[PDB]
Design a binder for this molecule. Structure first.
Ligand SMILES: CCCCCCCCCCCCCCCCCC(=O)O[C@H](COC(=O)CCCCCCCCCCCCCCC)COP(=O)(O)OCC[N+](C)(C)C
Ligand SMILES: CCCCCCCCCCCCCCCCCC(=O)O[C@H](COC(=O)CCCCCCCCCCCCCCC)COP(=O)(O)OCC[N+](C)(C)C
Ligand SMILES: Cc1ccc(O)c(O)c1
Ligand SMILES: Cc1ccc(O)c(O)c1
Ligand SMILES: [Fe+3]
Ligand SMILES: [Fe+3]
Ligand SMILES: [Mg+2]
Ligand SMILES: [Mg+2]
Lengths: 256, 256
C-alpha cells in the first residue's frame, strides 16, 4: 500500500490526531492503569490479526464519508474486511455459487441496471457481489466453505442490466473471541451488523462505487456497530407467489 | 494489566476518541490510499514490537499530565519504555554499575535529599535510577551490555540523603529502523530526545514519583520527540576542579 501524501500533510494530520487523543486523555483523566490496559490491548489487536477488522468497524465509515462528498451517484458504504478480488464471472442473469445448505434459504432475486448520472444504461458494467451465509460466515474466512461461496463477478448485459439470484442475507456478528470483541464487551456495546450485501460496481470510464444494501425492518439497521448503514441503501423486497423476495436497485456511476 | 474502569466510562472515552479520529479524517479529507497505508502501518507497529515505544513517545506525556494535576511535589515525567524493576540496591553514597568504556566519560555526581511537602527529610527512601550510556544504549535493550549497566536502586540515608556518581548522559535517538522511525521520517520530524536521567523515588507512606532530569543547554531540550521535557526538570551541573560535573537536586514526595 502506497499513498501520495506530502510530509507537510502527514505532519498536520499527525498533529491533529495526536492532539485529539491527548485532549481526550486530559478530558477524561485517563489514569496509568488505564494507559497500561490500552497498551496491552493494542498489542493484542496486532497479535490477533484484528487491525483490518477493528479499523473497518470503527474508522472506515469516516473515510467513505470523505469519498462520499465527491460523488453524486449511488451512495457508497464501507468495503469491510471481507472483499476478495477476481471472483468468478457470471452472466448478467445468474445465480451466485452456493451450497446445498444454502438452497434451503429464501431466495433473493436482485435486479436492476447500471447507469450514468443522466440515467443512461452502461455497457461493459460489472457487479462484484459478496455476502455472508445464513450461518453468518464469509467464504475464505471460514474453513468449511467453498472459496467462492456467495461471491461472484456479474457481467451486465449490453444495457447494463442484471438479474442476480442469491440467498436472503441475515445479520452478521463480528468475531468476538478477540480484542475487538473485548473492546465492545467492556463498554456494554453490541457486536452486530445488519443483514447486508456488499457490492463493487464498475464500468468503462467510470469511477467504481463500493457500497452495501440493507433490508427494511431488518434488525440492527439503526444500530450497526460499523456505523455503515445509510437510509438510501435500505432495500424493500417484495415476496413473489414463488416465495422468493424480489427487489430492483439501480446503480448510478460518477465519471472517472 | 488491569484497570477499575466502568463500561460507562469506557463508553464515553471510546466515543470521544473515535469521534476525534473521525473528525480528523473529515477535516483533512483522508483518502482510501492513505487509509490503506495507515492500516498497514498499524500492523507493522505490532509486528515490530513497537507499541510500547510509539505510545511512550506520542501518548504517555498526556497521561503523566493527568497525574501531574493531582501532585504538589517534584514534577513528574514519563517512565518511557526502558524501566526495569528490582535493579541491584546500592548504599546512599555509591557509583552506578558501569563498564570500562563507561569510565572514559565525564562523571556526573548527583546529590540531594528526598523530602516531604514541608521539606522534612524522609528515612526509608529509595531512588531507582536508569539511563542510557554515551553510545545511546540502555542495558537489557542492547545485547552487548551487562544487564545492570547504569541501573540501580539507591538506598538513601537516615535523612533521605543520597550522593550518586554516574556518567553524564548524552542525547538518545529513538530506534528508527522500524514503523515509529518511518512515521517520524514521513513527516520530516526528528527522532531525538534530550540527554536525561530516569528516576523513580519512593518512601514509606509516600506516593512515588517517576520523573526525568535534563541538562541546561543540552541539545533537543526544546524539541524532545516525546514532549516529556519540563523546565523544572532541567539541571545545571557545575564542573569541579576534578573535572566532574556536580549537581544537587532534591525530591519532594506527596503523601500516599
Ligand atoms: C486507529 C488507532 C486506534 C485507536 C484506539 C481508539 C480507541 C480507544 C479505546 C481503546 C481502549 C481499549 C480497552 C479494551 C480493554 C479490554 C478489557 C481488558 O482486556 O482489560 C481488562 C481490564 O478490565 C476492563 O474492564 C477494561 C478496562 C478498560 C480501561 C482502559 C481504557 C483505556 C483508554 C485509553 C485510551 C485513550 C485514547 C485517547 C483486564 O481485566 P482481566
Ligand atoms: C494510540 C493509537 C495510535 C493512533 C495513531 C495516530 C497517528 C496517526 C498517523 C499515523 C499514520 C502513519 C503513517 C506512516 C506511514 C509510513 C510511510 C509508509 O510506510 O508508507 C509509504 C507511503 O508513502 C509515504 O510517504 C507515507 C504516506 C503516509 C500517509 C498516510 C496517512 C494516514 C493518515 C490516516 C490517519 C488518520 C487518523 C485520524 C509506502 O511507500 P513505499
Ligand atoms: C466492518 C465490517 C465487519 C463485518 C462485515 O461483514 C462488514 O461487511 C464490515
Ligand atoms: C519515549 C521514550 C523514548 C526513549 C527513551 O529513552 C525514553 O526515556 C522515553
Ligand atoms: Fe459484511
Ligand atoms: Fe530514556
Ligand atoms: Mg454485553
Ligand atoms: Mg528527515
Amino acid at each position: 500500500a502506497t499513498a501520495d501524501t506530502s510530509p507537510e500533510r502527514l505532519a498536520a494530520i499527525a498533529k491533529d490526531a495526536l492532539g485529539a487523543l491527548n485532549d481526550v486523555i486530559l478530558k477524561h483523566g485517563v489514569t496509568y492503569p488505564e494507559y497500561r490496559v490500552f497498551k496491552q490491548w493494542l498489542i493484542d489487536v496486532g497479535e490477533g490479526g484484528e487491525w483490518p477488522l477493528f479499523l473497518d468497524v470503527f474508522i472506515e465509515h469516516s473515510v467513505e464519508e470523505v469519498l462520499a462528498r465527491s460523488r453524486k451517484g449511488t451512495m457508497g458504504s464501507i468495503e469491510g474486511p471481507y472483499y476478495i478480488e477476481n471472483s468468478p464471472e457470471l452472466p448478467s442473469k445468474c445465480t451466485l455459487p452456493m451450497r446445498e445448505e444454502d438452497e434451503k434459504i429464501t431466495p433473493l432475486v436482485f435486479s436492476g441496471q447500471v447507469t450514468d448520472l443522466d440515467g443512461n444504461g452502461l455497457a461493459g458494467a460489472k457487479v462484484e457481489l459478496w455476502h455472508a451465509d445464513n450461518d453468518g460466515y464469509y467464504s475464505q474466512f471460514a474453513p468449511h466453505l467453498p472459496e467462492w461461496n456467495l461471491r461472484g463477478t456479474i457481467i451486465a448485459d449490453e444495457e447494463g442490466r442484471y438479474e442476480i439470484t442469491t440467498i436472503q442475507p441475515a445479520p452478521y456478528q463480528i468475531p468476538t473471541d478477540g480484542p475487538t470483541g473485548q473492546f465492545i464487551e467492556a463498554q456494554n456495546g453490541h457486536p452486530w451488523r445488519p443483514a447486508h450485501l456488499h457490492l463493487i460496481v464498475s464500468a468503462p470510464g467510470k469511477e467504481s462505487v463500493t457500497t452495501q444494501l440493507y433490508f427494511k425492518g431488518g434488525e440492527w439497521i439503526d444500530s450497526d456497530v460499523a456505523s455503515a448503514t445509510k437510509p438510501e441503501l435500505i432495500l424493500d423486497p417484495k415476496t413473489g407467489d414463488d416465495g422468493k423476495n424480489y427487489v430492483t436497485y439501480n446503480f448510478v456511476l460518477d465519471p472517472a
